[PDB]
Design a protein around this nucleic acid. Structure first.
Lengths: 66, 154, 117
RNA sequence: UUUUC
RNA sequence: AGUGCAGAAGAGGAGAGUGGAAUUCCAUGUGUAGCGGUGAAAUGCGUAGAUAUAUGGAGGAACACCAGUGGCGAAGGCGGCUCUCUGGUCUGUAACUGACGCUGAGGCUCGAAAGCGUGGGGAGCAAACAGGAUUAGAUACCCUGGUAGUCCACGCCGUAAACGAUGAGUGCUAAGUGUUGGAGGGUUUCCGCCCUUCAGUGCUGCAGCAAACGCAUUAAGCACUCCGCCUGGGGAGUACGACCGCAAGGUUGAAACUCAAAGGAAUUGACGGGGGCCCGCACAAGCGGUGGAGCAUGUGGUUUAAUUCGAAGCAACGCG
């Protein structure tokens, strides 16, 4: 019953929307789990592959220590 | 012991001064169950107090047992495999007890062959905050809170 | 010399040793100390107390060259690595930021034979 | 987290 | 049982390229007496500058979080990312084929790790081996080193606790509750409830079984079809013979002779260098002590022409 983000009728995750993307990462930079954010199974996977594409092109950091 | 707390062994005040603290001073000094000698030396020590620079000797006793008597303490504990220590509180009972303990410690080896001007000048100079026993309390406060660091997280 | 006035120190604490070194703002090494360096042995380098006295003996030479503030690098997951920081606070420094960086791999190599004791 | 019963 | 029409999910496979972090080595700046290691040490490395520390350079392997009783595949197994080739599965419908099905001795294909041939590669890791420790001994556990191998290509061997120790095909028999992918009815902004219906995937449970254990719509229940296998424990998956392999070895597979047992599960008691709770001058707080001196004793030892005999941790030593 926990509110998934797909209340808006967005189908394709648009691959670059950082407003639609920072919700699922930690402040340090990891991935927040699916029970934490409360979404369906397939959208977890779509966001996972989306930010794994987004980590290579410098649109998001790997490690945030320095 | 193990089941819980215990009783307290209530005491009765003096034949003259009517003070449980001086009663505790009697029952600390008494060696081998001879109360006559300890009573004689304590009343004669108060007489020596009353002669030279002393008016209410119970009150100079209370000043001395202000300024020797602590407020904190250390305790050498262990948690998981090493011997540590911690700045610890103290009950008011053990506070007076450790004060009397330190006083009667330094009331042993002043250097006078009088068995009571060591006592008399001990609580006089402790009311004057001098001698090693007030400085013993100050060293106890000194060694307290230097060990605050490695004991605040336990 | 020169009143460097700032820099970063280093803390590295195994299960059998802990070692402190204090650098410049980049930094070159200024002065360092270890639990073994203060005349200890073997097992007893695992205590937080030796970490305290070694960190303070490092600070004594560190602030004889002009030094007020420091940041703290911590490697070496161990035991006394907090007492190092807190006694580093004790004898006259101004620790303003702590970074505990002990790097995780991403499963590239193997650990050794998982011991049988 | 030392061998032995 | 199929095929067309319309959708859905997925670490199913091969080929090609690419990313970040980490360990080691190299180069250079700072830096000096230690570093590493263990229950404790020691071998080892450091004054020819180590560890540490900052900047780049090299190279090989594995892919943090995501990650879940999730998913995919006939099993072995498959998790960084992208593109090219490509297999299988499920849901609505039944206009199309008119029984075209199941199981399958020999045969063919695939097959974790270790091993073999030839050519590459070699960062960690580590059989063999060397040295240091423990022990009465230690060719072992612990520590410092260290090769073949682990990776890639092309061939070879065909084995396991390859297990759900449960062969495949199909029909029937109370429920309850979570999850993965779907499809319909209405409340409906339902895309955020509920009701109905397909499949896989967990868990608790009734008739029924079973030696109990337990199984129970994903039967070890009720029944048909087809295939493989068993007949006391040892001797032994050994000998001999036949086929395959470069080789190790694999597949098929006895008897001579021995014993009256070997077995499955479930109770009771004992035990464990297994665990969870409680108590006790057992710890903790305190007071006074023993081990120093000297003396009286009881032992052990040594000694005598005689050292009368018993008592050995708590539970022998101002004991008989």
């Amino acid at each position: 019953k926990v509110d998934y983000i797909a209340a808006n009728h967005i189908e394709y995750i648009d691959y670059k929307d950082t407003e639609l993307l920072k919700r699922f990462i930690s402040e340090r930079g990891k991935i927040l789990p699916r029970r934490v954010t409360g979404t369906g199974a397939k959208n977890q996977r779509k966001l996972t592959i989306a930010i794994k594409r987004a980590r290579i092109m410098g649109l998001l950091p790997f490690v945030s220590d320095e | 012991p193990r089941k819980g707390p215990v009783a307290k062994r209530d005491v009765l005040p003096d034949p003259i001064y009517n003070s449980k603290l001086v009663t505790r001073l009697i029952n600390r000094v008494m060696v081998d169950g001879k109360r006559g000698i300890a009573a004689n030396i304590i009343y004669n020590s108060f007489d020596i107090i009353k002669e030279s620079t002393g008016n209410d000797p119970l009150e100079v006793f209370e000043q001395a047992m202000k300024n020797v008597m602590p407020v904190l303490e250390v305790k050498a504990r262990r948690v998981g495999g090493s011997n540590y220590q911690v700045p610890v509180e103290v009950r008011p009972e053990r506070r007076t007890t450790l004060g009397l303990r330190w006083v009667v410690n330094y009331a042993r080896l002043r250097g006078e062959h009088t068995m009571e001007e060591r006592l008399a000048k001990e609580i006089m100079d402790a009311a004057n905050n001098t001698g090693a026993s007030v400085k013993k309390r100050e060293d106890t406060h000194k060694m307290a809170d230097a060990n605050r660091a490695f004991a605040h997280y336990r | 010399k020169k009143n460097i006035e700032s820099g970063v120190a280093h803390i590295h604490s195994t299960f059998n040793n802990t070692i402190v070194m204090i650098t410049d703002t980049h930094g070159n090494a200024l002065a360092w100390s270890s639990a073994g360096s203060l005349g200890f042995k073997g097992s007893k380098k695992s205590t937080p107390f030796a970490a305290q006295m070694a960190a303070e003996a490092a600070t004594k030479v560190a602030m004889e060259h002009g030094l007020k503030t420091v940041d703290v690098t911590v490697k070496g997951p161990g035991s006394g690595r907090e007492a190092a920081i807190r006694s580093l606070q004790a004898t006259g420094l101004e620790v303003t930021a702590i970074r505990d960086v002990t790097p995780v791999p991403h499963n590239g190599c193997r650990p050794p034979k998982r011991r049988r004791v």
